[PDB]
Paper text:
A spike mutation common to almost all the strains circulating today is S:D614G. This mutation appeared early in the pandemic and has been associated with higher fitness in experimental work in vitro, in vivo and in epidemiological settings. In particular, S:D614G has been reported to affect the conformational landscape of the spike glycoprotein, so that a particular domain known as the Receptor Binding Domain (RBD), discussed further in this work, may be more exposed for increased interactions with the main cellular receptor ACE2. As a control, a cryo electron microscopy analysis of the S:D614G mutant was also performed and presented in Figs H and I in S1 Text. Cryo-EM was used to obtain maps of the S:D614G and [S:A222V + S:D614G] mutants at global resolutions of 4.2 and 3.4 Å respectively from which structural models were derived. Under these very stringent reproducibility conditions, we were able to report a majority population of 1-up structural classes and a minority population of 2-up structural classes in both S:D614G and [S:A222V + S:D614G], with similar percentages. The conformation of subunit C is quite similar in the two structures (RMSD 1.108 Å over 1074 Cα atoms), in contrast with the other two subunits (RMSD of 1.381 Å over 1070 Cα atoms for chain A and 1.389 Å over 1049 Cα atoms for chain B), which differ especially in (i) RBDB, (ii) RBDA, and (iii) NTDB. Nevertheless, it is important to note that refinement of the cryo-EM structures in 1-up conformation of both the S:D614G and [S:A222V + S:D614G] mutants in their corresponding maps yielded B-factors that were notably different, especially at the RBD, suggesting that this latter domain was more flexible in the [S:A222V + S:D614G] mutant. We again see that our two cryo-EM structures reside in the middle of the 1-up cluster, showing room for further opening of both dominant RBDs within the 1-up macrostate.
Numbering used by the authors:
A (entry chain B): 1028 to 1075
B (entry chain A): 932 to 1146
C (entry chain A): 304 to 399
D (entry chain A): 592 to 621, 641 to 676, 689 to 827, 854 to 883
E (entry chain B): 740 to 829, 854 to 931
The structure:
Amino acid sequence: KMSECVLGQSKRVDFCGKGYHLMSFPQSAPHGVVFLHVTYVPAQEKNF
Amino acid sequence: GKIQDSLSSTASALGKLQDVVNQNAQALNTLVKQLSSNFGAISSVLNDILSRLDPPEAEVQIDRLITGRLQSLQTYVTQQLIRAAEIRASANLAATKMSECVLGQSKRVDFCGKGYHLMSFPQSAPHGVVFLHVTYVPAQEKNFTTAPAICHDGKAHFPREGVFVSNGTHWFVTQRNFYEPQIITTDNTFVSGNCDVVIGIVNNTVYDPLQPELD
Amino acid sequence: KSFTVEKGIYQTSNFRVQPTESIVRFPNITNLCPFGEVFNATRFASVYAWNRKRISNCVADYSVLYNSASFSTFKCYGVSPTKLNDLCFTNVYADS
Amino acid sequence: FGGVSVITPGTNTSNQVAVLYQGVNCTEVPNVFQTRAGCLIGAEHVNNSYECDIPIGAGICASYQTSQSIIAYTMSLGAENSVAYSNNSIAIPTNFTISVTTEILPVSMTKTSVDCTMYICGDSTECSNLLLQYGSFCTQLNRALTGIAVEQDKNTQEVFAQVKQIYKTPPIKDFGGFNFSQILPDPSKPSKRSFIEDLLFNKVTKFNGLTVLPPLLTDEMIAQYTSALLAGTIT
Amino acid sequence: MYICGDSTECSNLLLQYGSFCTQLNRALTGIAVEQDKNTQEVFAQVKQIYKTPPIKDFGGFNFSQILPDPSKPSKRSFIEDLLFNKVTLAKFNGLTVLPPLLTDEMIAQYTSALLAGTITSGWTFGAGAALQIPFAMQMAYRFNGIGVTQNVLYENQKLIANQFNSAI
Ligand SMILES: *[C@@H]1O[C@H](CO)[C@@H](O[C@@H]2O[C@H](CO)[C@@H](O)[C@H](O)[C@H]2NC(C)=O)[C@H](O)[C@H]1NC(C)=O
Ligand SMILES: *[C@@H]1O[C@H](CO)[C@@H](O[C@@H]2O[C@H](CO)[C@@H](O)[C@H](O)[C@H]2NC(C)=O)[C@H](O)[C@H]1NC(C)=O
Ligand SMILES: *[C@@H]1O[C@H](CO)[C@@H](O)[C@H](O)[C@H]1NC(C)=O
Ligand SMILES: *[C@@H]1O[C@H](CO)[C@@H](O)[C@H](O)[C@H]1NC(C)=O
Ligand SMILES: *[C@@H]1O[C@H](CO)[C@@H](O)[C@H](O)[C@H]1NC(C)=O
Ligand SMILES: *[C@@H]1O[C@H](CO)[C@@H](O)[C@H](O)[C@H]1NC(C)=O
Ligand SMILES: *[C@@H]1O[C@H](CO)[C@@H](O)[C@H](O)[C@H]1NC(C)=O
Ligand SMILES: *[C@@H]1O[C@H](CO)[C@@H](O)[C@H](O)[C@H]1NC(C)=O
Ligand SMILES: *[C@@H]1O[C@H](CO)[C@@H](O)[C@H](O)[C@H]1NC(C)=O
Ligand SMILES: *[C@@H]1O[C@H](CO)[C@@H](O)[C@H](O)[C@H]1NC(C)=O
């Protein structure tokens, strides 16, 4: 995820968080890694 | 050519693979040696114990050996399974690298080699698969001033596929990964909305190549 | 287990600081527990009736009980007799 | 109480050693530089920071290179340079370099078989009967090892056998200036193994009731699958 | 030490058993290396640490939580600094708990480098020498990958920046 999501955008759906993925920011915790995922979701719809 | 030289000059390439080979060999060797250990018994060799002991006594000592020997076997099988599972994961990854780098191109960054993976080749190794990764890395970078949108008539264009890059004399559009400069034109742009809203914008000309030809 | 060693870090043996002195701080009481009045007495009771002559608050000895009387049987369970000298028990009971 | 680890550059290079007692205070017992991972004795703490060499613990690393003496550095990670940033400044590459990187992953291990009866109770029938009382132990062990061997065979099938047909490279060498001679099979050499593969093979290097079963796929057969995939990719 | 304890007599019986004593220690050490090595694989993704740019211009994006604070000790980000605060709120015998190869401090630097790398150079740093790019411009590329045209980002960068800032 660190290589796949932080370094470049991941095409695989639901690899990074939920929805379309723009980028991820790595975080450090004791004995763990916390990832913040930036994702694009379509809010509103009009029928056509 | 370099890779051939690197492989012949050191055992480090196979260290990741070799560690697995050595570690498995060492585990088997310990267990085999175990046979020598008494495990609380009168004597290590099984036949020797049977030869010098009457059945009831021999019964007890045999049981002791089996318990000691059963435990030894259990450790090996338990040890082997964990290693087997670990190897299995590599094969899936191993099998994945065998097919995915090799068949098609992987858009995922750093999954195969370092940098953009153009193609990959796999070389058989004893008890392992070696993957050679061809990747594209951009060596040289030249500083350029850039802006997001260009306002021509109060409508601002954006690049169709490339960031706007200006030496500082004129504004041209080049692909973000290699420096190719193309005179900005309608063909390389599209105009949406009005150039008041965009945070960063630079006034610039448009070519309209059909206009000089028509006249 | 090899003549030649590659560069690295290897752990070979544990290091224990070894204690400089042995310090014994047994209870200060001088009074000694008596085993004669229970051993060597006028008469005991019936085998269906016993007396737990509980022993507490004194300092015992057991080497005296090895050659003074040659006992017919002497089976020390859960304990090694000869080492009974160097450990402090709790609420010793005698039966007869 | 503490474990002792001796840091050696390597027997071949030198005989000098550095011993780090693990956890014990440096003053304890008899250049006893006191670290945070224990109490090193036989190394000189430098002020400079180099790449890791002989890892120790909590930062400190030991190297045989600074006439010669094992020195323990603080293991700084990388050179700190900040890419020049601005809203109006961009950098675009003018040249590109193609490179080859090798990643090495294990696919299988020696299929090992152990008869439970023969190792545990030996030749004697008397001893074997005692083993029977335990019952399912023997059988369970044999089954697990058999399963592992099958997985070792299966893992190979999955990793290499992704192609139904063994494609064979064209006699023509018109590959648009790419020389693939080393990676591709050589007709002169036995087992149809590529030159790069040969080097890899060279570098890697009934006994007592334990039997190593033959691999389901031979080394030569594995090379063909690998050769086929490579052949298929180029063509 | 654990099984036999201090006494020499207890040790002799352990010798009879074999290399079980020795084998168990080896397995634990392997595990110990993995936890350090694991860390190495996960965080040593960058060849060289990149200092965070002094200029904070983020093209309308506020990264104060994510990025490390110089004033604060230990170089841990607001998110990062606080996480240790939360975790804190949330040998002795036969057992030595060895320290890791990478000190928590060092791990902090690695994370910062990736964060610094991502913002300043996009995905260029992953594949080679990091290339400085405008953040707005980087985001523009990101939209293109997911099929939303870059103009879209530029038209309402302000709206996007606020949502991102609010989300963080
Ligand atoms: C228990 O009986 C034994 C044996 O009679 C006593 O041991 C004798 O004690 C006297 C007086 O101290 C000594 O002079 C003798 O040498 C000892 N041996 C024998 C065989 O008489 C012992 O004192 C009595 N009481 C106990 C142990 O409490
Ligand atoms: C791009 O990089 C390549 C590879 O470094 C350059 O090719 C070299 O150019 C130098 C100078 O002309 C020659 O002496 C070398 O023989 C070339 N090969 C190598 C491997 O260095 C190339 O000049 C660079 N620039 C381009 C194509 O614009
Ligand atoms: C289009 O059709 C539905 C009909 O139920 C309508 O309510 C709404 O405007 C549109 N639907 C969605 C899911 O956006
Ligand atoms: C852009 O600037 C470079 C550097 O001065 C120059 O070589 C190039 O000619 C410029 N573009 C044009 C059209 O002159
Ligand atoms: C770029 O950032 C600087 C910060 O000093 C600011 O003065 C300038 O107006 C900005 N320009 C653009 C085009 O964003
Ligand atoms: C760009 O054009 C706009 C038109 O509204 C004008 O306000 C501005 O001064 C111009 N800037 C430059 C640098 O030409
Ligand atoms: C070691 O003991 C000395 C005793 O003076 C003390 O100053 C030092 O802080 C101790 N350090 C450790 C890790 O025990
Ligand atoms: C781009 O940025 C620097 C700023 O000092 C500039 O001088 C040089 O042309 C380039 N060098 C870099 C990014 O190191
Ligand atoms: C390819 O490599 C082989 C072996 O080094 C060599 O004989 C051959 O000349 C090389 N190049 C071409 C174009 O064949
Ligand atoms: C970001 O938010 C912090 C938190 O208050 C503030 O101090 C800082 O000035 C803001 N910086 C921006 C928008 O660059």
